Structures are given as C-alpha cells and as structure tokens.
C-alpha cells in the first residue's frame, strides 16, 4: 500500500500530483486544451450574429423539433448551435442579428433532449428574450 515513512514527503506529493491527471475534472480544468477549444473561451456569455434558423430534431424518446439558432460568435468567429428557449421565441430572432448566448447548465453537455447543443439565447438585439416573451419590451432592428 502507501509508504508511511517520515522522509517520504517527496515520494508522496509527487505521486499525488502524478495521479491527479487521471481525474476527469482536474485534467479538464488544468491541461489548457478544453479552455482553448471552448468557443466561449472562459466566458459566462458570448455575443454572436445569427446565420440561420435550425430546427434540430430531438434525441430519440422525446419526439419534437427543438428550435435552435446557428450563431457565429464575434470575438473569435466560431460557429455554434444555440437553443432559443420558450415557445414562439424563435420568431423574435431574425437573421443577421446581435444575440447574447450563454451556457445551458452542464458546462459542455447537451442538456437533455437536444443533441449537440450547449448554448441558449438570452438576449436579442440588447433586449432579453424573457422580457419579449412576457410582453414587457419592444425589439428594435
């Protein structure tokens, strides 16, 4: 088992650090490959421009059409598929428009039903989707 010497510190600590890399979380956090391939790139939100409306077909058992929007980010130029939330919120978003995109919740997992979609629209042209759905504000263009 474990060496339990009094002069064994260097063996211990080095072993700990060596083994730390097999942890999926730690490696993800510290290797700097996930921080570079991430389209947001250490960002809470990004802001992109809409290219097209894409109706992604839902992952097996739950049979529906999830209304997403193919944004192209401004800050680097990566393409993203991004899910537009509540029903009839797709209608607010028009092609060639500013969109504030955020994560979904699981830090890089497709959340539930939608396959390969990590991101959700929060704002269209600087007004929130939550407001526009609830009829609180008007959308400029």
């Amino acid at each position: 088992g474990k060496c339990r010497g009094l002069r064994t510190a260097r063996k211990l600590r080095s072993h700990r650090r060596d083994q730390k890399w097999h942890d999926k979380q730690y490696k993800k956090a510290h290797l700097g490959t996930a921080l570079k391939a991430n389209p947001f790139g250490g960002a809470s939100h990004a802001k992109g421009i809409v290219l097209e409306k894409v109706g992604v077909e839902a992952k097996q058992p739950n049979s529906a059409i999830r209304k997403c929007v193919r944004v192209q980010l401004i800050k680097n130029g990566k393409k993203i598929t991004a899910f537009v939330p509540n029903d009839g919120c797709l209608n607010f978003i028009e092609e060639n428009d500013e969109v504030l995109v955020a994560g979904f919740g699981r830090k890089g997992h497709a959340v539930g039903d939608i396959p390969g979609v990590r991101f959700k629209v929060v704002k269209v042209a600087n007004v929130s989707l939550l407001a526009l759905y609830k009829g609180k504000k008007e959308r400029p263009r």
């Binding site: 097209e52 409306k53 894409v54 992604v56 077909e57 059409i65 193919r70």
Partner: protein, 61 residues
C-alpha cells in the same frame, strides 16, 4: 508457387524455391501494411466528415 517438394531435389533446387516463397511473403506484408495505412487514413477522414455534421449542416430551415 504450389509445387510439392520432390525427394530427388538438392541444394540450388530447394534453396532457390524457398527463397522465392520468402520473397513472395516479403512483398505480401508490404502490401498488407500499405492497405492497413490506406484504411487508417480513410477511416480518420470519414470520422471528420461525419463529426462535421453533428456540429453543422443538420436540422431543417
């Protein structure tokens, strides 16, 4: 070469016939390794062309 080794064959007859089979196989595992890298290069480029679809060019409108 599919010749049954007859008893009266000596050195130079046996030795050249064996060296022929050695050279068939040497040419053969070169040809097998060549196919092994052909399939490896074609699987890897089709892996990309299918993973490309997951990200973009799949949906509707």
């Amino acid at each position: 070469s599919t010749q049954p080794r007859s008893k009266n064959e000596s050195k130079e007859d046996k030795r050249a016939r064996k060296q022929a089979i050695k050279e068939e196989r040497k040419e053969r595992r070169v040809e097998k390794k060549a196919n092994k890298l052909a399939f490896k290069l074609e699987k890897r480029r089709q892996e990309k062309e299918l993973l490309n679809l997951k990200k973009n060019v799949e949906g509707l409108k």
